DNA sequence: CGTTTTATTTTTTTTTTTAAA
């Protein structure tokens, strides 16, 4: 994808490779193979190749300190600067998205879902999990999938793709009936391959009734098992996801449940815990700070708001911060019950369907 | 082979002289034990073989086969010595293996062929069990009868769905098993293996396409279950009978959290009934339970059933619609080759069990068998080839969630959830879940989990509360129940007050009895009654409009 | 001519006689097979071992010279022999564990008289034989079980069989149809042990007798059969009473989809219809509206009229019965 | 101057298409 042309397609070649070399291949990386082209003697073409090259050693705001592991983290001296004072979380409003502008709640929240969640030590008899469901909505002519778009270049896994096209098989494979190697090959798929990854998807809105079978899966059972003319296995979700529907006229009018302003599926809106809306208004000064923005968007100087922490020591902090694994015996942890029903006393009033999947 | 002088030594010496843990060696007595089961497959620990000489283990892998022969040799030569006896009617002989390091799939490649091997696997779909030949005979001019046989069935394995290398595709795998280590093989299960690694005797040598189709090919010497899902008595006889059970086993009953402890008394009744009693000359009457209750969305109707898969005597679990198929079409075709077509699972754990969420979602026309297996204890497949039936004595269970929502209120419950009235006819339990206004001290410390009745028994008491005691009376003082029928048909009348029927209390016989399975009774009187009346008291108080009181002045007194 | 079962008989026990039980599940029909026959080319009587393909040799040979190697061997099955077949099968019992596992099951084999003697729905004993019909060394040599028979010895399992294969009963029969006093009596028996349609019983005595069917010079053939009805609730022992109705002359019972609109020989079976065993059989069901519209024509043309007909395939069955029915019901109110 | 030739069927998933009060 580095490579693309007009017209044509990625079009398909075919490979072998060694002992050494073998099994040792991932989801979309970019490797450097050689190109000890070959025939076959049937003829028809093909190729071959012996040489591949696609984090102890340390990401980019460095050069070599110590840690845990040898630079696995070792720049705390300059990251701790950007780690402790907290106004750096303004850096993570701010500092992140010069060129864009909506809603500065979405800019203070998305980074945790980016970061790593729980995975605690607990039980066998029943897995706890990190990640949660997520979704945006509003209407378009809102400047919403610049952001889904650009997740694309900011962080790995970010699989920005279309879910207008996809089937109910887009996840895993579906069938083999001849001698292809040995007529049972289907496991292949679209989703696994997120290696400590996440799938954002668009245009989750015409979308079929058979989609909730996979998401379903998505914060209990992440299992993967086909009712085909083959086998089931499993494997394990390690994924989250975005929502991406829209409203049929838009605006959500604020006189029927918001629920009842899409009145999608039943479970969907018990298993998506948040949903961070952004919702049209018409008070004009509030677009005229976009265009005197975009008055640097094409004049190419400084054409953005000036930074203060650039990307590569935004991705190298991420690690840092998960391999810590806090310890909560907090009495303000047990005083989330007074938190909770204080919460509860305001739901008590606007009488959604809420419970602990929300706590 | 002159070294083959020695390796029979070390065995001869081996089997019969050796000693450990205290004396009386199994290699004395499992050759005997064997040749009093008649089942040639005595074994060998690697383990105590490297603790006499592990210097076989490097003479080995030149040619394990042979190996193998100068093992069965020995065998054979102390059995018949020993026991000349033996000497009619099978007379050959081999042995096993469990190198007891646990290998993974995945690994065997260039260098792991045809050589000291130990490895795991899980089963999938395969044959039948049939037979091979064995010998080298035909000539006589100058043979295909009176030629020795050796039976056989393939196998299919599959990998851990648990230690996954995170989306590396699962994985399969060709290899065989032999006449004695066979007919144990069957879907869904795993087990460990010694193993061993080669190819097809020859697998297309020739100049080809353009790559060889080679196979890998692999069987058992010894197969160890891993599964083993049927079969420190001071408890139960003395404990687990009395009715102070029904907080003992509810201290231990479903240890989630404190709620409802209600179900707590439920499921202390739930795997616990079942029975013939099939009457002269009218038909088999009756031994099934059939139990549902209408959740929430945020209730626990998922996780609503979860902690009795492991434990009961039979087990089926089946998620409802959204991937459910109608193969719970038969024309009488058999499955004939390279064919398959498929049928129902009821009688799979006939007298078991289906465990269900979206019970409600589910297709007609699998709805029409699972009904009448609980009507007429038969259900019919329809205007096929054959119009055949399935064996239904088993029991209904499910976890379904509301219609339309989240939940009615005492309004009837039809509407509360969308099931038939026909189907429910036959229905038997109930419970419901509602919350208003400890626990979260409670979530809390199980989040912070850093790392009564015995659990590895508990099955069968159970097994003695299905098995063992089994009396019947006649009318108590159940004519009592005339009123039950006539009252409360008539006092409630028109709220919603028709569901009082005998079998109403035909759901009761069943558990009535059931009181006894738990305590080994063997009578029953009006001290089970009311405690089956507290849940029927309790469960159905529910399902009768928000007059409510109905049922609270009308039978709390028999509470 | 002691029994055993299928899961027990292997490698050790082939070329060799047997004793077991099953039942019977479907087979095929009646075809061929000979022992000898000949050729022209040298005209003897082809002996055969076993119920190869004559060999170089070809006899239309010595006439001088002149050859005729690879076979000039026509089959003359003028001079033939003749034999029989059926290909028989079994089922397992339902005792020994299909329950967790799979009932298996395995193919048999008949030669002379001893078809036309099974039919399905049976409980048989025989002796056979554990014989072969394949060749080896199939990734090395999976390979052939059948049997064939000899010498079966069927059951008959006590009261039910006056189906396929006294006057002191008649003695029984008249003495009571001497008294007057049947059309009221037996009206306490058709539920011969509990309660129901008691005064109204009295009105069956028409309809399992029936009417007459009785035909006229002119066209039409009249509703020898004639139909009634029942409706209500459950709870009134409405399932178990019908259910005893079977064991009370032929028919089936259940109602609505659940009876009702092969990979081998090219043949396209199909079972037929609903006069099957309703045709002197009557039946009595529930669900008529709780049903597929789809198959609710055929109760139009069954029933009415017995106005049959066929149009999958392009053949018309022109089929009739004396049959009826009854009808039950959990309908409105 | 002799000694040998030749066959495959059912199910998937897509894109087409089609059904009832
Ligand atoms: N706060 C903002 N920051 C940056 N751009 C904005 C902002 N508000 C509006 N815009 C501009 O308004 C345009 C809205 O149209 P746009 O191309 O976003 O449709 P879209 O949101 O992609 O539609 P959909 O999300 O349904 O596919 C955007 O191109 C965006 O540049
Ligand atoms: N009464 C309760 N007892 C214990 N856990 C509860 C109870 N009520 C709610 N929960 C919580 O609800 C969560 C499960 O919600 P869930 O069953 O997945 O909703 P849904 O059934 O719609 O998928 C559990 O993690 C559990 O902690
Ligand atoms: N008068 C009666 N005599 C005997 N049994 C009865 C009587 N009334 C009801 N029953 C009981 O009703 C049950 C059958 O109910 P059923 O007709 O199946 O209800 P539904 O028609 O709703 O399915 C029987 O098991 C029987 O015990």
Same mark, same amino acid.
């Given at each position: 994808?580095?490579?693309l042309?007009?017209?044509?397609?990625?079009?398909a070649?075919?490979?072998?490779?060694?002992?050494?070399?073998?099994?040792?291949?991932?989801?979309?990386?970019?490797?450097?193979?050689?190109?000890?082209?070959?025939?076959?003697?049937?003829?028809?073409?093909?190729?071959?190749?012996?040489?591949?090259?696609?984090?102890?050693?340390?990401?980019?705001?460095?050069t070599?300190?110590?840690?845990?592991?040898?630079?696995?983290?070792?720049?705390?001296?300059?990251?701790?600067?950007?780690?402790?004072?907290?106004?750096?979380?303004?850096?993570?409003?701010?500092?992140?998205?010069?060129?864009?502008?909506?809603?500065?709640?979405?800019?203070?929240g998305?980074?945790?879902?980016?970061?790593?969640?729980?995975?605690?030590?607990?039980?066998?008899?029943?897995?706890?999990?990190?990640?949660?469901?997520?979704?945006?909505?509003?209407?378009?002519?809102?400047?919403?999938?610049?952001?889904?778009?650009?997740?694309?270049?900011?962080?790995?896994?970010?699989?920005?793709?279309?879910?207008?096209?996809?089937?109910?098989?887009?996840?895993?494979?579906?069938?083999?009936?001849?001698?292809?190697?040995?007529?049972?090959?289907?496991?292949?798929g679209?989703?696994?391959?997120?290696?400590?990854?996440? *799938?954002?998807?668009?245009?989750?809105?015409?979308?079929?009734?058979?989609?909730?079978?996979?998401?379903?899966?998505?914060?209990?059972?992440?299992?993967?098992?086909?009712?085909?003319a083959?086998?089931?296995?499993?494997?394990?979700?390690?994924?989250?996801?975005?929502?991406?529907?829209?409203?049929?006229?838009?605006?959500?009018?604020?006189?029927?449940?918001?629920?009842?302003?899409?009145?999608?599926?039943?479970?969907?809106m018990?298993?998506?815990?948040?949903?961070?809306?952004?919702?049209?208004?018409?008070?004009?000064?509030?677009?005229?700070?976009?265009?005197?923005?975009?008055?640097?968007?094409?004049?190419?100087?400084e054409?953005?708001?000036?930074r203060?922490?650039?990307?590569?020591?935004?991705?190298?902090?991420?690690?840092?911060?998960?391999?810590?694994?806090?310890?909560?015996?907090?009495?303000?942890?047990?005083?989330?019950?007074?938190?909770?029903?204080?919460?509860?006393?305001?739901?008590?009033?606007?009488?959604?369907?809420?419970?602990?999947?929300?706590? | 082979?002159?070294?083959?002088?020695?390796?029979?030594?070390?065995?001869?010496?081996?089997?019969?002289?050796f000693?450990?843990?205290?004396?009386?060696?199994?290699?004395?007595?499992?050759?005997?034990?064997?040749?009093?089961?008649?089942?040639?497959?005595?074994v060998?620990?690697?383990?105590?073989?490297?603790?006499?000489?592990?210097?076989?283990?490097?003479?080995?892998p030149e040619?394990?086969?042979?190996?193998?022969?100068?093992?069965?040799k020995?065998?054979?030569?102390?059995?018949?010595?020993?026991?000349?006896?033996?000497?009619?009617?099978?007379?050959?002989?081999?042995?096993?293996?469990?190198?007891?390091?646990?290998?993974?799939?995945?690994?065997?490649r260039?260098?792991?062929?045809?050589?000291?091997?130990?490895?795991?696997?899980?089963?999938?779909?395969?044959?039948?069990?049939?037979?091979?030949?064995?010998?080298?005979?035909?000539?006589?001019?100058?043979?295909?009868?009176?030629?020795?046989?050796?039976?056989?069935?393939?196998?299919?394995?599959?990998?851990?769905?648990?230690?996954?290398?995170?989306?590396?595709?699962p994985?399969?795998?060709?290899?065989?098993?032999?006449?004695?280590?066979?007919?144990?093989?069957?879907?869904?299960?795993?087990?460990?293996?010694?193993?061993?690694?080669?190819?097809?005797?020859?697998?297309?040598?020739?100049?080809?396409?353009?790559?060889?189709?080679?196979?890998?090919?692999?069987?058992?010497?010894?197969?160890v279950?891993?599964?083993?899902?049927?079969?420190?008595?001071?408890?139960?006889?003395?404990?687990?009978?009395?009715?102070?059970?029904?907080?003992?086993?509810?201290?231990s009953?479903?240890?989630?959290?404190?709620?409802?402890?209600?179900?707590?008394?439920?499921?202390?009744?739930?795997?616990?009934?079942?029975?013939?009693?099939?009457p002269?000359?009218?038909?088999?009457?009756?031994?099934?339970?059939?139990?549902?209750? *209408?959740?929430?969305?945020?209730?626990?109707?998922?996780?609503?059933?979860?902690?009795?898969?492991?434990?009961?005597?039979?087990?089926?679990?089946?998620?409802?619609?959204?991937?459910?198929?109608?193969?719970?079409?038969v024309?009488?075709?058999?499955?004939?080759?390279?064919?398959?077509?498929?049928?129902?699972?009821?009688?799979?754990?006939?007298?078991?069990?289906?465990?269900?969420?979206?019970?409600?979602?589910?297709?007609?026309?699998?709805?029409?068998?699972?009904?009448? /297996?609980?009507?007429?204890?038969?259900?019919?497949?329809?205007?096929?080839?054959?119009?055949?039936?399935?064996?239904?004595?088993?029991?209904?269970?499910? /976890?379904?969630?509301?219609?339309?929502?989240?939940?009615?209120?005492?309004?009837?419950?039809?509407?509360?959830?969308?099931?038939?009235?026909?189907?429910?006819?036959?229905?038997?339990?109930?419970?419901?879940?509602?919350?208003?206004?400890?626990?979260?001290?409670?979530?809390?410390?199980?989040?912070?989990?850093?790392?009564?009745?015995?659990?590895?028994?508990?099955?069968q008491y159970?097994?003695?509360?299905?098995?063992?005691?089994?009396?019947?009376?006649?009318?108590?003082?159940?004519?009592?129940?005339?009123?039950?029928?006539?009252?409360?048909?008539?006092?409630?009348?028109?709220?919603?007050?028709?569901?009082?029927?005998?079998?109403?209390?035909?759901?009761?016989?069943?558990?009535?009895?059931?009181?006894?399975?738990?305590?080994?009774?063997?009578?029953?009187?009006?001290?089970?009654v009311?405690?089956?009346?507290?849940?029927?008291?309790?469960?159905?108080?529910?399902?009768?409009?928000?007059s409510?009181?109905?049922?609270?002045?009308?039978?709390?007194?028999?509470? | 001519?002691?029994?055993?079962?299928?899961?027990?008989?292997?490698?050790?026990?082939?070329?060799?006689?047997?004793?077991?039980?099953?039942?019977?599940?479907?087979?095929?029909?009646?075809?061929?097979?000979?022992?000898?026959?000949?050729?022209?080319?040298?005209?003897?009587?082809?002996?055969?071992?076993?119920?190869?393909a004559?060999?170089?040799?070809?006899?239309?040979?010595?006439?001088?010279?002149?050859?005729?190697?690879?076979?000039?061997?026509?089959?003359?099955?003028?001079?033939?022999? *003749?034999?029989?077949?059926?290909?028989?099968?079994?089922?397992?019992?339902?005792?020994?564990?299909?329950?967790?596992?799979?009932?298996?099951?395995?193919?048999?084999?008949?030669?002379?008289?001893?078809?036309?003697?099974?039919?399905?729905?049976?409980?048989?004993?025989?002796?056979?034989?554990?014989?072969?019909?394949?060749?080896?060394?199939?990734?090395?040599?999976?390979?052939?079980?059948?049997?064939?028979?000899?010498?079966?010895?069927?059951?008959?399992?006590?009261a039910?069989?006056?189906?396929?294969?006294?006057?002191?009963?008649?003695?029984?029969?008249?003495?009571?149809?001497?008294?007057?006093?049947?059309?009221?009596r037996?009206?306490?028996?058709?539920?011969?042990?509990?309660?129901?349609?008691?005064?109204?019983?009295?009105?069956?005595?028409?309809?399992?007798?029936?009417?007459?069917?009785?035909?006229?010079?002119?066209?039409?053939?009249?509703?020898?059969?004639?139909?009634?009805?029942?409706?209500?609730?459950?709870?009134?022992?409405?399932?178990?009473?019908?259910?005893?109705?079977?064991?009370?002359?032929?028919?089936?019972?259940?109602?609505?989809?659940?009876?009702?609109?092969?990979?081998?020989?090219?043949?396209?079976?199909?079972?037929?219809?609903?006069?099957?065993?309703?045709?002197?059989?009557?039946?009595?069901?529930?669900?008529?509206?709780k049903?597929?519209?789809?198959?609710?024509?055929?109760?139009?043309?069954?029933?009415?009229?017995?106005?049959?007909?066929?149009?999958?395939?392009?053949?018309?069955?022109?089929?009739?019965?004396?049959?009826?029915?009854?009808?039950?019901?959990?309908?409105?109110?």
């Amino acid at each position: 994808q580095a490579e693309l042309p007009r017209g044509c397609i990625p079009r398909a070649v075919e490979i072998i490779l060694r002992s050494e070399l073998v099994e040792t291949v991932q989801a979309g990386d970019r490797y450097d193979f050689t190109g000890t082209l070959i025939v076959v003697p049937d003829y028809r073409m093909a190729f071959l190749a012996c040489s591949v090259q696609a984090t102890d050693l340390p990401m980019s705001e460095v050069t070599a300190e110590d840690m845990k592991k040898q630079m696995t983290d070792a720049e705390w001296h300059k990251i701790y600067e950007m780690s402790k004072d907290r106004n750096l979380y303004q850096n993570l409003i701010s500092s992140l998205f010069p060129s864009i502008y909506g809603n500065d709640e979405v800019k203070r929240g998305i980074l945790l879902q980016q970061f790593g969640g729980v995975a605690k030590t607990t039980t066998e008899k029943t897995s706890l999990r990190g990640d949660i469901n997520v979704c945006i909505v509003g209407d378009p002519s809102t400047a919403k999938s610049q952001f889904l778009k650009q997740v694309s270049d900011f962080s790995p896994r970010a699989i920005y793709t279309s879910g207008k096209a996809s089937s109910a098989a887009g996840l895993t494979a579906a069938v083999v009936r001849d001698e292809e190697s040995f007529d049972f090959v289907i496991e292949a798929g679209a989703l696994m391959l997120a290696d400590n990854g996440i *799938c954002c998807i668009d245009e989750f809105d015409k979308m079929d009734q058979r989609d909730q079978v996979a998401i379903h899966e998505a914060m209990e059972q992440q299992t993967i098992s086909i009712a085909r003319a083959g086998v089931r296995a499993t494997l394990n979700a390690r994924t989250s996801i975005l929502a991406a529907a829209n409203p049929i006229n838009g605006r959500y009018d604020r006189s029927k449940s918001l629920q009842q302003n899409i009145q999608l599926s039943a479970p969907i809106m018990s298993r998506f815990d948040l949903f961070f809306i952004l919702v049209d208004e018409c008070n004009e000064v509030v677009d005229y700070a976009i265009a005197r923005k975009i008055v640097d968007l094409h004049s190419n100087i400084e054409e953005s708001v000036e930074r203060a922490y650039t990307r590569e020591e935004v991705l190298r902090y991420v690690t840092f911060a998960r391999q810590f694994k806090p310890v909560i015996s907090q009495e303000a942890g047990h005083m989330l019950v007074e938190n909770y029903g204080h919460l509860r006393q305001r739901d008590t009033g606007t009488s959604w369907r809420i419970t602990v999947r929300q706590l | 082979l002159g070294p083959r002088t020695e390796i029979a030594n070390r065995f001869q010496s081996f089997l019969r002289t050796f000693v450990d843990e205290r004396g009386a060696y199994t290699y004395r007595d499992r050759i005997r034990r064997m040749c009093e089961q008649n089942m040639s497959s005595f074994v060998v620990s690697y383990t105590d073989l490297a603790n006499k000489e592990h210097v076989l283990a490097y003479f080995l892998p030149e040619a394990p086969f042979q190996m193998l022969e100068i093992f069965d040799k020995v065998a054979k030569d102390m059995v018949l010595s020993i026991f000349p006896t033996y000497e009619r009617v099978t007379t050959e002989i081999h042995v096993r293996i469990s190198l007891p390091l646990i290998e993974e799939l995945r690994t065997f490649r260039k260098l792991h062929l045809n050589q000291l091997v130990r490895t795991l696997g899980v089963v999938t779909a395969t044959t039948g069990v049939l037979p091979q030949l064995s010998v080298i005979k035909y000539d006589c001019v100058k043979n295909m009868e009176q030629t020795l046989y050796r039976n056989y069935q393939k196998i299919t394995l599959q990998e851990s769905p648990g230690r996954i290398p995170a989306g590396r595709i699962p994985r399969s795998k060709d290899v065989i098993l032999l006449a004695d280590l066979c007919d144990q093989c069957k879907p869904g299960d795993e087990l460990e293996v010694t193993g061993i690694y080669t190819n097809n005797y020859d697998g297309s040598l020739n100049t080809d396409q353009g790559f060889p189709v080679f196979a890998t090919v692999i069987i058992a010497n010894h197969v160890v279950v891993k599964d083993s899902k049927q079969v420190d008595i001071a408890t139960i006889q003395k404990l687990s009978k009395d009715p102070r059970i029904v907080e003992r086993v509810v201290a231990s009953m479903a240890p989630s959290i404190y709620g409802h402890d209600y179900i707590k008394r439920a499921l202390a009744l739930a795997l616990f009934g079942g029975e013939s009693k099939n009457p002269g000359e009218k038909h088999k009457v009756r031994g099934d339970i059939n139990l549902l209750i *209408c959740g929430d969305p945020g209730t626990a109707k998922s996780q609503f059933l979860k902690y009795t898969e492991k434990v009961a005597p039979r087990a089926v679990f089946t998620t409802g619609q959204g991937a459910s198929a109608v193969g719970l079409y038969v024309r009488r075709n058999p499955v004939s080759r390279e064919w398959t077509l498929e049928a129902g699972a009821l009688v799979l754990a006939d007298q078991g069990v289906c465990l269900i969420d979206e019970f409600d979602k589910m297709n007609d026309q699998d709805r029409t068998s699972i009904h009448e /297996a609980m009507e007429q204890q038969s259900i019919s497949i329809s205007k096929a080839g054959i119009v055949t039936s399935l064996q239904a004595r088993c029991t209904v269970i499910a /976890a379904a969630n509301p219609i339309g929502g989240r939940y009615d209120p005492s309004m009837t419950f039809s509407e509360n959830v969308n099931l038939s009235e026909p189907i429910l006819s036959r229905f038997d339990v109930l419970c419901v879940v509602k919350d208003e206004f400890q626990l979260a001290k409670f979530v809390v410390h199980s989040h912070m989990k850093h790392h009564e009745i015995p659990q590895d028994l508990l099955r069968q008491y159970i097994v003695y509360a299905k098995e063992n005691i089994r009396p019947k009376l006649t009318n108590i003082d159940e004519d009592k129940i005339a009123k039950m029928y006539a009252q409360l048909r008539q006092e409630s009348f028109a709220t919603g007050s028709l569901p009082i029927t005998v079998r109403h209390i035909e759901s009761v016989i069943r558990m009535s009895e059931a009181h006894a399975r738990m305590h080994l009774r063997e009578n029953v009187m009006e001290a089970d009654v009311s405690m089956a009346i507290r849940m029927m008291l309790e469960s159905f108080i529910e399902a009768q409009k928000f007059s409510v009181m109905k049922k609270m002045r009308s039978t709390f007194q028999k509470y | 001519s002691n029994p055993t079962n299928i899961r027990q008989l292997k490698s050790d026990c082939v070329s060799k006689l047997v004793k077991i039980a099953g039942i019977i599940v479907a087979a095929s029909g009646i075809s061929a097979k000979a022992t000898r026959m000949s050729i022209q080319c040298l005209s003897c009587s082809t002996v055969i071992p076993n119920l190869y393909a004559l060999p170089r040799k070809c006899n239309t040979e010595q006439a001088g010279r002149p050859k005729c190697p690879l076979d000039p061997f026509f089959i003359m099955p003028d001079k033939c022999k *003749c034999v029989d077949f059926q290909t028989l099968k079994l089922q397992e019992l339902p005792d020994f564990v299909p329950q967790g596992e799979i009932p298996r099951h395995l193919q048999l084999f008949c030669d002379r008289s001893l078809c036309e003697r099974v039919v399905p729905g049976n409980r048989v004993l025989i002796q056979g034989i554990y014989s072969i019909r394949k060749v080896g060394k199939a990734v090395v040599g999976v390979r052939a079980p059948y049997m064939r028979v000899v010498g079966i010895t069927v059951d008959s399992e006590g009261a039910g069989a006056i189906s396929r294969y006294t006057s002191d009963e008649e003695e029984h029969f008249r003495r009571m149809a001497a008294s007057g006093d049947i059309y009221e009596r037996l009206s306490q028996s058709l539920a011969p042990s509990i309660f129901g349609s008691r005064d109204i019983k009295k009105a069956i005595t028409c309809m399992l007798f029936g009417g007459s069917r009785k035909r006229l010079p002119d066209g039409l053939c009249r509703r020898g059969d004639i139909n009634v009805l029942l409706l209500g609730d459950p709870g009134t022992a409405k399932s178990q009473l019908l259910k005893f109705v079977e064991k009370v002359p032929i028919a089936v019972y259940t109602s609505g989809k659940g009876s009702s609109t092969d990979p081998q020989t090219r043949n396209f079976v199909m079972e037929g219809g609903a006069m099957v065993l309703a045709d002197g059989g009557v039946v009595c069901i529930d669900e008529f509206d709780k049903m597929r519209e789809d198959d609710r024509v055929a109760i139009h043309e069954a029933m009415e009229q017995q106005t049959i007909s066929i149009a999958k395939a392009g053949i018309t069955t022109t089929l009739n019965s004396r049959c009826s029915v009854l009808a039950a019901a959990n309908s409105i109110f």
